[PDB]
Amino acid sequence: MLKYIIPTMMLMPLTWLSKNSMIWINTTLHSLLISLTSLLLLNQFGDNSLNFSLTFFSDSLSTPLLILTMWLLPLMLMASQHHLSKENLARKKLFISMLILLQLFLIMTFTATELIFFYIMFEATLVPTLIIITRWGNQTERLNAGLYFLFYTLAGSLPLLVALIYIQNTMGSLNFLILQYWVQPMPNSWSNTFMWLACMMAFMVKMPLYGLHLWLPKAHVEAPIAGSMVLAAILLKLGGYGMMRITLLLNPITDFMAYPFIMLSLWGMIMTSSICLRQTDLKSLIAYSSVSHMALVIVAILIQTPWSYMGATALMIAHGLTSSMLFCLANSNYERVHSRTMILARGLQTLLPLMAAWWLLASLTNLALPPSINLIGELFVVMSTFSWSNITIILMGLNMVITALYSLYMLITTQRGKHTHHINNILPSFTRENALMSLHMLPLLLLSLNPKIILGPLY
Amino acid sequence: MNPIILIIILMTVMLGTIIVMISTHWLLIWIGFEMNMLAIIPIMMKKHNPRATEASTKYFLTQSTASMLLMMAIIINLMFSGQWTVMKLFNPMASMLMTMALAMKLGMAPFHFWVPEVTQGIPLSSGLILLTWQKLAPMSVLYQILPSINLDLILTLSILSITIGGWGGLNQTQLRKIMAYSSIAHMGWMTAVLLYNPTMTLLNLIIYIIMTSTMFTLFMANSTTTTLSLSHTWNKAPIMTILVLITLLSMGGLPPLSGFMPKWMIIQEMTKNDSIILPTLMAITALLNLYFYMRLTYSTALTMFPSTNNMKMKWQFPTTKRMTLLPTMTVLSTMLLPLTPILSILE
Amino acid sequence: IRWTCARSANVYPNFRPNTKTSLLGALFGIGPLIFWYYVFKTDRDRKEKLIQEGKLDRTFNISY
Amino acid sequence: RWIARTFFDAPEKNYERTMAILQIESEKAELRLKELEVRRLMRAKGDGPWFQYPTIDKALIDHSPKATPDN
Amino acid sequence: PTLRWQEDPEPEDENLYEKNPDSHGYDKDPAVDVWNMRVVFFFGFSIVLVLGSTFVAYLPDYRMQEWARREAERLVKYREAHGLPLMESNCFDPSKIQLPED
Amino acid sequence: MTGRQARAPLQFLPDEARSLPPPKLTDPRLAYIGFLGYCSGLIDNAIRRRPVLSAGLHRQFLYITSFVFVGYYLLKRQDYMYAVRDHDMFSYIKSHPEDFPEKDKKTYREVFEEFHPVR
Amino acid sequence: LLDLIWLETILPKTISLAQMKMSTTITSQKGLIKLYFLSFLITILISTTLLNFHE
Amino acid sequence: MSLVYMNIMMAFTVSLTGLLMYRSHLMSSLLCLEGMMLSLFILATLMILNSHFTLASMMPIILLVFAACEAALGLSLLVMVSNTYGTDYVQNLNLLQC
Amino acid sequence: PFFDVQKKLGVDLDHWMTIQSAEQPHRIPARCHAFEKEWIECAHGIGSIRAEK
Amino acid sequence: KFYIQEPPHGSPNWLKVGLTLGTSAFLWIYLIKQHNEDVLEYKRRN
Amino acid sequence: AKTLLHQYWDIPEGTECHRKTYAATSIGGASGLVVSAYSVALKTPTSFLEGVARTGRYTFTAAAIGAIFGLTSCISAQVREKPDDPLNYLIGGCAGGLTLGARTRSYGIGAAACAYMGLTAALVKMGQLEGWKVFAEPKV
Amino acid sequence: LQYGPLAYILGEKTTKKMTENSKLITVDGNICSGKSKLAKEVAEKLGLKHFPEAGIHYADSTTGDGKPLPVRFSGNCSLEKFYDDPKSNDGNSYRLQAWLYASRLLQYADALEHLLSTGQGVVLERSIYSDFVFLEAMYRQGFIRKQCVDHYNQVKKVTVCEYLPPHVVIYVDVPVSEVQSRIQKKGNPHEMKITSAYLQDIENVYKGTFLPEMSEKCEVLQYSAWEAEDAEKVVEDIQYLKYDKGPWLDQDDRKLHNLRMLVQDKLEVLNYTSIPVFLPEVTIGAHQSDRVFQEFTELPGRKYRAGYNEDVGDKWIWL
Amino acid sequence: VVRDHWIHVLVPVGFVFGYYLDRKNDEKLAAFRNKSLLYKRELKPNEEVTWK
């Protein structure tokens, strides 16, 4: 792991001591070689997690997400040109190095034994993302978006620190194993209720749940493509990762005290899939898709079945890939026509002809394509929640119907029926765009072949 | 002024603080505070505008009545158990007036009205020396009289100072009142820990002094009073932008950055007691004061304002002050997260 | 463009919380939520009572 | 077999590493708990070398024949 | 009588085509364009994707699978040979318990 | 935690700190301090309009030396501090053992837990 | 109605307007001196005889 | 305690109220600070004399020479204000608003 | 904080002003000499809290 | 060459640069001597 | 003060009624004295009769909050017959917030005061019941 | 710099470079009439070092290379466009006005340093006080809205109240038709195209407002039209007066020390140039400023501190 | 050829250095060399060590 951290340090002065028109190839090639050495991590077996350099350990809750970050970095590094090529050398190098430092605090977050180290690297994940979206947002409410963003994520995640410190000096250390192997069951007085509500409320902020969700879509639609993809995929699935870790304590009360969040989550899932049925601004639909999936993930973590945890981590990885890709398609359409609205750019089956193949493929992976990883995750979540209660399946299936409906609406309204024939600036699609389509939809199909890699540690 | 005269006067401000730090006799403490006042007045009114005259007048009245109330506390102490040892007092009344003397001295929310008034109407050098030294020296006094304090004093003054220094600051566009409101906020953080483990408070003192010296050197990069002047500092220099970014967020205190070490260890050795509602309330108001830092950041280093010609005329010339000690204090004030085991450097 | 700025973010100015707005808000938000809360408490209490009887049909009910 | 031979670690190395690492951090947790117990009882009673606030020195205390006996 | 500004209506919306018609997506320097297509379409697919596919194709028994197959086969052959009931309940022996009583 | 018999003032390293070993050469924390000194010199080049990564190499050498030297002495003080904290603690442990009970290592054959199944 | 207007009123608008009104009541001090010393005086007296600190 | 000490402390706190609440001029405020100086002087002096604590008899005279130079600094400031305006009112300080 | 330059330089240049039981200038006591000497020798090498006990 | 009437510095002084190099090399030699004395003091005491 | 809050928490809650209401009006008188003292200290009312009106307004609002809150505290505890739940004081804090809003003659101030005063009164009883220490340990 | 406190501590004073050689004289006439003829005469016959007229590219020729930078950077004044069309609402009068004000202030501060060191006293021409007179008369013709006149009034309030007014001002009166004949016999076509009532307003304000509002600060010498060359008269009149008024009586060392440290670090002078009030003729959006700023860094001398600059030299960047 | 274009060597240097640093740390952490009750065999036969 420290051999995976230290070349990400040394990759940072690469962009600094490389001259102009030469930085690009260097950063691409070297971060891809880091991605190979990243996929070399997968040694995990059987009995234990692989634990070393005492701060570090890897589950299979952490191995696939860590490979997801260390593979989604160079994809993004390639993805974020044509909107800052005409910017200056200094701000270009600063942008790239800020992304690299964002990756470093992400990997520090994902290999955190000690939960205080986890919280420090958590808000360390926060702080560059604001600078990215606020400096290169390329819209006019990005300022308010970043402000809402930081105050929601901090003020939700702030008392989590106090609760973890209370754990640190009422029990002993915060190794995750010594959090395990020692955890005494805590009874149902009111202070235990507040401590559980503190930790769960911090990560409810981060996912988001339904009641705290306007945090996200402004921050998605007013961001550059790099910040939007890292934000959506890596940050929300990081919140889920952290909840999967911290739920090992406070077991014998969360049954009693974890009802109303299920109701808020399911009704918010239906309302979110309904609100993304009728909006304009194509960019926003994928944000509300993300909120729908994360509400389903929250149901999956509040129930405590191994079926639920395997479906949870699969849903995390699959929707990270899918929503990141479909953000990239939205950015490609917006760089074709500088609109950000939807109904202006109709047509696009005729022109950009094999762009239609990638809209089809991304939207069917959003559809729960019948061997896709998205379907596997949603299916095992539905199985586990049916075992939780025999009546929840109406909301799950109604979610499925509306999810298919807005996916198909996005398909056949943005990219179907008639070119509006007053446009005359859309080019043929470049090779870079099709390269990014390929770099998104090869790993999803390879994971569709052999998926037993990425299911949870409750295997 | 002569440079001889200013080196003498700065030597006497230093001498007053060293006498306060060094003595074991209460009259020496009182003479130290007085001499510190006497010398710190003509650092103000380096110019001669009526702003400085009124500001030094207000500061003089509040500071002198604080010093005489401190002498009242000493004289009550010797109306009771009679010896000149700087130690535990022997009256809750004497401790009460002594804490209120310091609360008028260095600024707490019942007693804080003079601080933004006096910090606006002066140049930045006088504000620098007053904030740093005048908030350094009486913390030594509190560290010497910690065993005999009614905790309701420090609790009330600390909580109320955090929330007043928070809520003031949403409206002020002047830089100096922003910095004084930040000062009262850190006085709350530096005072509420005191009856628990004072090594935290003295480390917080060193942190706050290093941060505020960085901030006033960056506002002495060119003489700026509003935020608009800082947008023009963007247009004339690129690296002052990124340093205002990093040091403003370190005044905000985010965990990858070194302004989080005051919050973090204090919450730790605050909640190895079982005060929990008080730390979490303090940390919520600590989230509150970060907003005006954030709107200053959004004003200058992140967005870009429209600007003015003759900055074309300013491009040729160097910004050729000497920065007093800028780089050392910058990267010692911001990158110092992974050295929180330098807490125990202190005792 | 004008209609997009109308439907998107010019909703909130103007807005005053009136009788109609607040009543329809507290109906459409809290109502179905508290409804699903009651039905889930109903099914969960029925299930806990039936398995506390001892006669749940757990003839084999492995994947929980 | 080759991937086993050249790129990975045995479960022996990993297993004894985990056992050593648990024993180390177990010692850390137990020392920290004993530290907070000693700190609370030592602030309570004061029978230890930590919390001794600076009392009166006796070297400046004199005894020599005054001008009045009945002190 | 009012302008509030001095800047140009900016920019000219330069599509990268019509000047280098063999170009790939990014900037017009035609050597490094070939270098970029080179570096992604070799060191992203031909040494990354296909090698990762072979590397996760076979690897050890991931989370100890085929070991568990062979161990289960040996133990079930043992249990049905030596007369004992397959998967006896009470995984810990109740001789090693001291239950609270009344 | 006050004196602790300060007689013997602040005394930046006491006589007793010579019994513990000093921090080694190329310990990682002093290496961090050296990198931070390097970054200090680089931003020192950045404040003035001199070109960065050149024209300040003697100042690079001076800042790196100053920070590594000061941080070395601070690490020596830190090791003294933690050594004396553990020494005070175990001395008071061995002082009155009868007030610190050593509890019985009950095996799990007799430690009962209320079960409460998670469904 | 549910997401935009009510969720933005209840969490951002409520907190933001509360802090803004507390700002406009705190920092709106006319620059006089007799007022500040009367605040000091009643603080002293309300700390002595009403909410005691000398016990 | 005694009888005299109550009356001297009563005189002190009345002088403190006269220092804090003050209506029109600043000279009367600094003059009440001088009266508070007198009160602390007399209090510490009678304490030290009744104790026959002959050793630290430095307190009253050094207290008063120092609070005297405090009053000297104050008179310099007040005359500076009255130079740069017409009077020495609490008005004309109404600028530099909060 | 508080330093001990008063201790390290050795010359107790302020520990003569402090209490009684010292060089009063012509050797007389105060009114309450022996009480101070008894209380100081009660709580001399004591950690200030079992002194209060 | 190419500059008119104001090089304010950049014409390198030689007092300060030699002073910096000398005090820095001296500070290194002092700390290495200190570290060797500490190691030998440590193995002498134990 | 300590004395009247101790009088308020002395009575079991529980049914020993209307002493609770009188103690809560004493809470209101103290709060009104604080707010009125700072408000007339930092306004220059111009003139004193209007200052008497302002002080009377603040003390009357605070005393009315105390009175209505004590009445609904006692009544809810007598009806629900469960002297340990915080939900009765949740209802009490919302009722006090609504009457604060009605004496200030608004709607939104009343509803937000209902929410925040209810949740904080729930926190007050909840911490007094489980046991959260008043203002200090001060030990370690 | 070899200054700060330590220069005043070691090097004794600056009183010793005074007086009756070192002084501030300032020759002010109307446009193109009292020009550097009389200024070069008083410089060459009074022993007193000359500074030229304050044009536009003085900021170009004041540091680094003396080759003037193009008007995209040092403008955007377009002085001949001002003389041709001082009525176009695209913004061409006030921008030029404030740029000339900064130019005058810059060369005034530099001449003040060259007075306070070494001597020998300087002759200025068309100093700052004539510039506020120019704004006054330019508003009398009705070229600029009153708001922007108030902005220049605010700049004048802040900047001028830190300095010392000069010793003597040689006013030179040349009447209407004589200036008009000189400008219509010079030859510059965009100067040929000037108007005459603007010249009249210059005359009217430049009589009625400058000369009363001196009041023996800046001791005046009013000269007629053909009272030029004619050099011994202005030399004997400068010599044979006595200086008894104005703030240049007593400083003594402290004020002169403060002005020496205020003139150095010229951004101290220029800190009060941008207020800003936002002036829809003056402000520039960030896009134009940013691309012009990057192209200004692309100039071969200005990029990162010409004292250290590569690609001219100076072979000492310490290896 | 390394001196010609040397930019493309930095991250293998970083990875091999991190690999060696993990090796040094594993040489540091390794107690319980045979003290497990699960992997406890007689070391044989060459020289003195069975895993590292």
XYZ file of C-alpha atoms in Angstrom, chain F residues 18-25 58-59 61-62 64-66 68-69 72-73 76, chain J residues 16-17 20-21 23-25 27-28 30-32 34-35 38-39 41-42 45-46:
40
model
C 20.820 11.531 27.741
C 19.692 8.068 28.884
C 17.281 7.509 26.025
C 18.693 7.271 22.486
C 18.427 10.316 20.221
C 16.422 10.197 16.993
C 18.407 8.478 14.289
C 19.760 10.076 11.183
C 22.053 29.084 -1.054
C 18.736 30.070 0.523
C 20.503 25.187 1.719
C 20.054 27.641 4.596
C 16.817 23.215 4.940
C 19.641 23.392 7.493
C 17.706 25.671 9.855
C 16.351 20.179 10.138
C 18.471 21.448 13.029
C 16.103 17.592 15.528
C 16.297 19.282 18.899
C 14.871 15.055 21.292
C 25.947 37.600 2.456
C 26.208 34.519 0.236
C 25.061 31.960 4.534
C 27.104 29.089 3.125
C 26.993 29.412 8.784
C 24.994 26.625 7.175
C 27.954 24.278 6.705
C 25.520 24.305 11.522
C 25.603 20.929 9.738
C 27.840 21.020 14.647
C 24.732 18.840 14.459
C 26.656 15.834 13.113
C 26.309 16.495 18.341
C 24.721 13.312 17.018
C 24.924 11.521 21.664
C 25.392 8.021 20.248
C 27.178 8.980 25.326
C 24.282 6.550 24.931
C 25.715 4.999 29.715
C 24.248 1.692 28.560
